[PDB]
Symmetry: C11
Subunit: 117 residues, 11 copies
């Protein structure tokens, strides 16, 4: 059926659970375990907490919520934070903080499914 409506078989579910019980690495692990079409992730919220200028340096902090969903319908959502310090230009700091926040949120949300992740 369509994504979010299919169901696993007994053997497939058992194998997946056994493997589970035991950021490119985590993405590769997820693709190998669930399959390229077996999982999805999205961003539900993001905002900038503060942007401060020190003596020629920028300090930035970003928050982001990441939602991970499976083919069956189960989901997990967690928060991620990104920080950049000691940089000279605003753009690089903001870019790094925003990307790191999303990556950390994805990692934390994907850890909830098992110890392997």
């Amino acid at each position: 059926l369509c994504f979010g409506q299919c169901q696993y078989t007994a053997e497939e579910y058992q194998a997946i659970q056994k493997a589970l019980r035991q950021g490119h690495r985590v993405i590769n692990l997820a693709n190998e375990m669930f399959g390229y079409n077996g999982w999805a992730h999205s961003i539900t919220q993001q905002n900038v907490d503060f942007v401060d200028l020190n003596n020629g340096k920028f300090y930035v902090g970003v928050c982001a919520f990441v939602r991970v969903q499976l083919k069956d319908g189960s989901y997990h959502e967690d928060v991620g934070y990104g920080v950049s310090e000691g940089l000279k230009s605003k753009a690089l700091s903001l870019e790094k903080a925003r990307k790191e926040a999303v990556t950390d949120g994805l990692k934390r949300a994907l850890r909830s499914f098992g110890n392997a992740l």
Copy 2:
């Protein structure tokens, strides 16, 4: 069926209830009890109560609502709070407070299902 619409069997329900009657640890317990696809959790609301600057120290407090849902449809929601004191940088304090709030909310919401959690 799809998540949120399936139903347990008599034997499975009895076994789950017997086991129930009796934050990585609680996550592992939940995955072992309900299964990797048997439970879900989400964040419904979050806000910053206050950010104050003392004599070189930051005090922060964060609130968060966490909703836990099962395969059948039952759900439980509870509040969690995170606090950071004595830190030097704003970003670390905010990150720690936000993550701790979500973790505490998840723990409290997952305790409502039984004594084992």
Copy 3:
């Protein structure tokens, strides 16, 4: 069927009513009576009434609405209030008040189903 659509049997309903006629304790009682998947609770509204600073002390009051729902569809909603006085730090006072409000609301809403609760 799915949660919120199932119906009780005559014998089960009679037994539940007889037991009913007669905050970890109330949670345990509810789980024993209705079952781990037989009841649910949620938070519909919450706000801070006031935060005042006395001579080195914080006074806080919080309101919260708690909704309790059963497997059949019946529901009960009630208000709860939490107060903290004599504390030194804002964060602890707020946390205690917020949690106590939710707990009191849950207790009051769960009392409406019978004398046992």
Copy 4:
């Protein structure tokens, strides 16, 4: 069927009407008459009319709308008011007023079904 969609039988309806023709007490009466799963109640609106400080005393007034619904679908909604005077602390006055308002609204809404209530 699900709550809000079932229908009474002729004998059950006749018995209920005969009994009807004739705040823990009213709750017990309702549970005995309709059953623990035969009625529900909720809060639709609530607000604080005024908070005034006299010579060391607090005067408070609260309004609340309470909606009572039955298994069949019939419903009744009424207003309730709570007042607190002569108290010393704001939190206790607010708590008492809010709870009393909800209780009075529930009583008034539950009186509309018959003389027994």
Copy 5:
């Protein structure tokens, strides 16, 4: 069927119309005529027109819309007004005005169904 979808029988409709052709009293009359599950009422809107302080007295006026609905689906809505004068305390005046407004609205809306009401 569910409330708001059932239909009367010819004899029942004829008897009800004959009886109709001819605030606890009106409530009792309605319950006797339509039945405890044969009618419903609700509040759609309410507001405070003005609150004025005279030489130690409070003058208050409240408006309210009341909607009455039957089992078949027919409905009638009317306005009600409540006034309090000569009182000393704000809370009692507001409570009396608000309750009287709802009661008057219910009476006026219930009069539209026939002369008996």
Copy 6:
């Protein structure tokens, strides 16, 4: 069927039209013609145009829209206005104006169905 979905019979429609071709009086006429469950009325909008204080007198004007609907689905909506002059107290003037506006709107909307009304 439910209200707003039923249909008339040929003889009933012919009789109703013949009678039609030819504020308690108009309400009684409508109830006698269409039946206690054959018509409905509601308020869609209402506002206060102005409140002015003359030399000890209040002048008030109110607008209201009234919608009348039948069992089949046909409907008619019209405006009504209420005015009060020469009164001493604000509350009585407002009450009279508001009620008169609704009554006039109902009359005008009910006149559109025929000459008898």
Copy 7:
């Protein structure tokens, strides 16, 4: 069927068209042509353009949109305007303008169906 879903017969449609090809008068004509349950009208928008005070006289102008709908589903909407000049009191001017606007809108919208109207 329900209003807005029925369909005419060939003979009835032909007769209606022949009669069509050829404010109480227009209302009577419409009721005679389409039937008391064959047409409907409503108000979609209304506002006050201006209220000016001359040397003891009030000038008022009101706009209104009127929508006319038939049993089949066809509809026509048109604008109407009402003006009052030379009056002494605000309330009468406003009432007359508002009613005249609705009447003119109804007339203009009902003229679009044929020359007879």
Copy 8:
């Protein structure tokens, strides 16, 4: 079927197209071509561009969008503009401008169906 869902026959469509290929006049033409129940028109938006006072004269301009729809479902929408100059009173200018705008919009939208209109 209901309006907006019926379909033409081959002969009727051919005749209508042949006639088409070739503001009371345009309304009469449309009623003769499509039928009294074969077309509809409505107003989707209207606003006042400007109102300026010259040396004792009013200049007004109004915009309006008119949507024309047929029985099958096809539709056409176009803009219309109305202007009044040299008038003495505001009300007459506004009325004339508003009505002329709607009429012009209807004409322009009805021209899109063919050369005959």
Copy 9:
């Protein structure tokens, strides 16, 4: 079927495509190609960019989005702009600009279907 749900036949589609491969003129072409009931157009957005007063002259610019839809469901949307310069009166400039914008948008959107348009 209803508009927006029908489908072409193979021969009709082939003929239409062959003819396509090759503002009253474009309207006539569209009506001849698709048919009077084979195409539709609408306005989705419109606004005034600026209105400036030079030495006795008005400069105006208007934007408009035009959406063209066919019987099958295919659609095309494009922007149109209208400009008026050297005029003496505001109303004529605005009218001309607004109408020209819609016409240009219609032309551009209708050109996307083929070279013939």
Copy 10:
């Protein structure tokens, strides 16, 4: 079926893919490849970034999002930008910028389907 719900055949899909693998020109190419009824395009968002006046010259920049959709349901969305410099009049600059933005967005969005575009 209706647009956005049909499906290609194996041979047609293979031919289209082979042709794909390899602003009037791109429009002609798209119409020849997918067909006059095989593709659609729309505008989802547009805004003006800035309008600055230099020494007698206007500088303008416009952004636009363009969404391209096919008969099956696949879609692609991309951003386009338009710039005008050295012009004398505001209207021409704005018109050119807005049209160029939409054209560039359409081109970029249509390039994503293959190398031929």
Copy 11:
């Protein structure tokens, strides 16, 4: 079936996964792997972080969220950032930043499906 509802076959899924395990280049790779109708992409959010003027130079930073969806229903969303520095004109900087942000977001979102991308 329609896009977002179809399902892969076992052999096709296996081949796609094997190929996956291993910005025109990435677009070509995606079209070759999934097919011209096998994938889609869209923009969910975009904003300008800051626009600063240095000594004759413009510094710009843009954020964008890109959502990639497949035929089955699986999806992945990621953030992209674009920066422009050292440019002389605002328009070129903004255009380059906005386009680069979307391209980077597309690349990052498309990398999540496998190592080949």
